[PDB]
């Protein structure tokens, strides 16, 4: 039945934040192996043909990618199922536009055009700090990158801003109570706030509290916290809404009172 | 009221480039020359049973 | 006598003069009588009725909508 690895993905089993239909067909892109996990990524074909409407079928996105137009983190990706993920930078210089994949408020990626001067660095969360042969310190970030010789005062869960062209860690933020952060998993997928607490359970799943810019509090696991600023000051540019998560009642009030129908 | 979709290509070479081949054939720019899927299939399966220069099926059908 | 088992049952032919439509050694399709295990009405020992005589129903022969094939 299953003697080896699988290579198909059914449309009904694909992640839900891809916001796919159910009548096009039985199958889904099935992102190829990459630096981001399968359930937490966003393939190139879905970002180009579904959210940007640049293409209309799979052939069109294939022949858009086969012209060396799309650059993910500086390098030119030719695959149409490459798993782009959190805090990535897309660049299409034929039209002069850059994006940044970040969860907006409702647990899905947004379209978040940024200035070309901001599409040079990216923030990365440290997952591992080990020592190699001859006592050389290494890093491992949330997107599989490995850095040799980091300054010996960066530890786990800290954030490092790296130059996209050279690697070469530039600056870093420390995991401490008072630092801006965005939640990247669970139920609060997208909300932004300050830490103010870190509960510790030796042996399993140390939980962390957060309190956003309106006095609302919510907790998560330490595995889903992402420090993105020193405090009340983001280092990357925030999307529209800024991870506030206004309730359904306030949603309805603002959608009705503003009468957001058209221009 | 009747609704559809339209494309305007900046040239005829780019228009001959991307353009799904069935749409080019809507106005003569391409011509799908073959016969039948079952002929292509049964031919390939006879070519599988000979080795070396397959004259009986690269030429003699 | 049933095909799949070989058992011998007794079946009822309900209508006025519907016994003329059933010769001997012809296969008939029978169904239940309506009580799921029991004799219905004044008839002792009978639990089934005949619904088809030879690929043609006893209600099309009773109204003339069809006829036996010989």
């Amino acid at each position: 039945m299953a003697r080896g690895p699988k290579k198909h993905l059914k449309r009904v089993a694909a992640p839900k934040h891809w916001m796919l239909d159910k009548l096009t067909s039985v199958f889904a892109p099935r992102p190829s192996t990459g630096p981001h996990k399968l359930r937490e990524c966003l393939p190139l074909i879905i970002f180009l043909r579904n959210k940007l409407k640049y293409a209309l079928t799979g052939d069109e996105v294939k022949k858009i990618c086969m012209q060396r137009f799309i650059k993910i983190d500086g390098k030119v990706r030719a695959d149409i199922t490459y798993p782009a993920g959190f805090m990535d930078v897309i660049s299409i210089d034929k039209t002069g536009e850059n994006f940044r994949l970040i969860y907006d408020t409702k647990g899905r990626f947004a379209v978040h055009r940024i200035t070309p001067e901001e599409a040079k660095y990216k923030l990365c969360k440290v997952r591992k700090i080990f020592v190699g042969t001859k006592g050389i310190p290494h890093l491992v970030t949330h997107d599989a990158r490995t850095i040799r010789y980091p300054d010996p005062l960066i530890k786990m869960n800290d954030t490092i801003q790296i130059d996209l062209e050279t690697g070469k860690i530039t600056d870093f933020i420390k995991f401490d109570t008072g630092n801006l952060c965005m939640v990247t998993g669970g139920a609060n997928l997208g909300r932004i706030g300050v830490i103010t607490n870190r509960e510790r359970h030796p042996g399993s799943f140390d939980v962390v509290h957060v309190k956003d810019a309106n006095g609302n509090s919510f907790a998560t696991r330490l595995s889903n916290i992402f420090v993105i600023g020193k405090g009340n000051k983001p280092w990357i540019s925030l999307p529209r809404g800024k991870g506030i998560r206004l309730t359904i009642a306030e949603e309805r009030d603002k959608r009705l009172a503003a009468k957001q129908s058209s221009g | 009221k009747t609704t559809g979709f339209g494309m305007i290509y900046d040239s005829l070479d780019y228009a001959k480039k991307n353009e799904p081949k069935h749409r080019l054939a809507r106005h003569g720019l391409y011509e799908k020359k073959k016969t039948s899927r079952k002929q292509r299939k049964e031919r390939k399966n006879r070519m599988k049973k000979v080795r070396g220069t397959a004259k009986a099926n690269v030429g003699a059908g | 006598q049933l095909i799949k088992n070989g058992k011998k049952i007794t079946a009822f032919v309900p209508n006025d003069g519907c016994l003329n439509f059933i010769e001997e050694n012809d296969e008939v399709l029978v169904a239940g009588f309506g009580r799921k295990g029991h004799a219905v009405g004044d008839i002792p020992g009978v639990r089934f009725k005949v619904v088809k005589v030879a690929n043609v129903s006893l209600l099309a022969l009773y109204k003339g909508k069809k006829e036996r094939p010989r």
Partner: protein
């Protein structure tokens, strides 16, 4: 086995338990005659929708006020019931929903509103007008005598812009009885 199809569907009515009940029979026939309906399935349909609205309302009514879910879904059900005009804007609370009747929804049909608004000489004339493409709701020609007319849409019902009854070429009968003057008494 895998296919790109959808299998979601449902029934829209429920038969009555007591099949032969003289009171129910004559009450449903009164209702069929005065709104010019075709079937009783078309009465059981409206009964079903009214029963489901009542169920939802009573369900929301047992929660404690100030509950966010009750507030949201009640303010939505009320707004959606006023949007078709089966509720007064001066009532607008879950207590008045349990006071509606089946003839508030049968009133708001299109066949009813075409007769009642004066485009037809009876409800039995109105049904054959709508079903013969003579009626237009804004720009749309609506073929369906069950089209539940929203509130703001009440002003806009009139005749189709290509139909004998108003700015239309005469039908095939007025054009052979006229051809009778040319091809029925002039050419044959």
């Amino acid at each position: 086995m895998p296919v790109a199809r959808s299998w979601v569907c449902r029934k829209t009515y429920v038969t009555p338990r007591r099949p032969f009940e003289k009171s129910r029979l004559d009450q449903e026939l009164k209702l069929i005659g005065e709104y010019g309906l075709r079937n009783k399935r078309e009465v059981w349909r409206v009964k079903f929708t009214l029963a489901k609205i009542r169920k939802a309302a009573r369900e929301l009514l047992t929660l404690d006020e100030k509950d966010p879910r009750r507030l949201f879904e009640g303010n939505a059900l009320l707004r959606r019931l006023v949007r078709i005009g089966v509720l007064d804007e001066g009532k607008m609370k879950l207590d008045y929903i349990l006071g509606l009747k089946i003839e508030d929804f049968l009133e708001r049909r299109l066949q009813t509103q075409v007769f009642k608004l004066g485009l037809a000489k009876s409800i039995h004339h109105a049904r054959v007008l709508i079903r013969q493409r003579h009626i237009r709701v804004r720009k749309q020609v609506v073929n369906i005598p069950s089209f539940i007319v929203r509130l703001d849409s009440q002003k806009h019902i009139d005749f189709s812009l290509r139909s004998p009854y108003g700015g239309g070429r005469p039908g095939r009968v007025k054009r052979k009885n006229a051809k009778k003057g040319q091809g029925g008494a002039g050419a044959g």
